[PDB]
A paper describes a structure:
A common step during their assembly is polyketide trimming, which Afyg1p, Wdyg1p, and PlAntI catalyze. In summary, the N‐ and C‐domains in all three enzymes are oriented in a back‐to‐back fashion forming an interface that encloses the intramolecular binding cavity next to the active site. The catalytic triad is formed exclusively by the α/β‐hydrolase domain with the nucleophilic serine located in the consensus GXSXG esterase motif.
Co‐crystallization experiments of the Afyg1pS257A mutant with 1,3‐DHN support these minor interactions with the active site since the ligand binds identically without the nucleophilic hydroxyl group of Ser257. In contrast to Wdyg1p, the cavity in Afyg1p:1,3‐DHN is enclosed by Tyr383, which is rotated by 90° compared to the apo state and extends additional pi–pi‐stacking interactions with 1,3‐DHN (3.7 Å). Strikingly, in comparison with the Afyg1p:1,3‐DHN complex structure, THN is rotated 90° in‐plane and shifted almost 4 Å deeper into the pocket, resulting in an open and spacious binding cavity between the active site and the surrounding bulk solvent that extends ≈7 × 10 × 12 Å3.
Author numbering: 3 to 400
Write the structure that this text describes.
Amino acid sequence: RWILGDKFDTVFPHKGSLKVLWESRWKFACSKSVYPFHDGSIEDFEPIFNHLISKNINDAASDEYTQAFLPTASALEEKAAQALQAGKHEEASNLLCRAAVVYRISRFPYVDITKPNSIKRVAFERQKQAYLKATSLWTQPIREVTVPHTYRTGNDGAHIPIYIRTPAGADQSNPVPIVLIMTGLDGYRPDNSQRTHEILARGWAAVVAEIPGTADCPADPADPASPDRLWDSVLSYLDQRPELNTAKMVVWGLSAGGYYAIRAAHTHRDRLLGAIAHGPGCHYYLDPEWLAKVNDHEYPFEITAAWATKHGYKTVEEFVAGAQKKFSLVETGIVDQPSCRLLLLNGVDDGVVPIEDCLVLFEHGSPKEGRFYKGLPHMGYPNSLPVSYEWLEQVLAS
Ligand SMILES: Oc1cc(O)c2ccccc2c1
């Protein structure tokens, strides 16, 4: 049935084994300081994972996993405190960024938005504090703005915390283009350092916002229209900001954020020059046959429990039964209207969201843009990253 083919019916070897996950993927990813260990150091993680493997802790959702990371984070914060006092601001920033990655992995894969007393929420709260302190020392610092949700209705929260970073020379006389990052299930606003570096290096502003049913997003996760109101608030705030040119704006949806990039490309087409959807779902990812096997593929841990809560469902059974008809951009007809330019990027052999969720968008609305990587899993890294920046350079060209 699925383009994924033989791999669909496979149980991936790291399933329920943090040992195999580490030894076969995460150890290498950590060494290279690439996702999910970007900004991070193997010297910080190897002792923690050796501890987790020795105690045979495989459930990332459990407190035993989360709390294994916190003493390392503490020691890094003290090393940073020492570095700062000695006037070593670059070292202190790096140590705090390293602490942020330790907190990030500790709260993998999902901070439960309904359980604010959870250790993973506490980990995320400490990560944000570490990260803001680290980035306050940058020549172009990341600044948090709490955007009032003026377009809030129903069960929407009041406040939209976003990260903004502006390149050197950005002012009312010379306002700069905007790349608006929409983050994912396991990546929130502090998890995008290198993306902000690249955006600023091309003379653009970086704005980072979390998606409904994650992190500090106030959008009603149960209301499919909640993202539309969320972006009405964010885009209205950016319109007012004198140094940011909203006439040259692109949205960048990462993984779970890809759904929201695709949706926004239709709902807000007249306010966007373009949208990138990186490893997106929009329809077939909520197919019960797909959700039956999604836990058996490349995602480091169980995903269906996190997905249930992120889609505003109290139970996984209720999620599998109801999600597609409610949230599908195809089923609901969101795709049957025009869109701004939309670049779809993924691995052909994505076992997290199906490649069919890129391909189906070519059978609706405006012409779409795509590059899909043969034999590559979810996100189609590393190939899919540099093409992202090539496309932004074209769309935002002077
Ligand atoms: O921002 C992201 C999010 C992901 O889920 C990724 C997965 C694999 C490789 C890079 C990623 C980057």
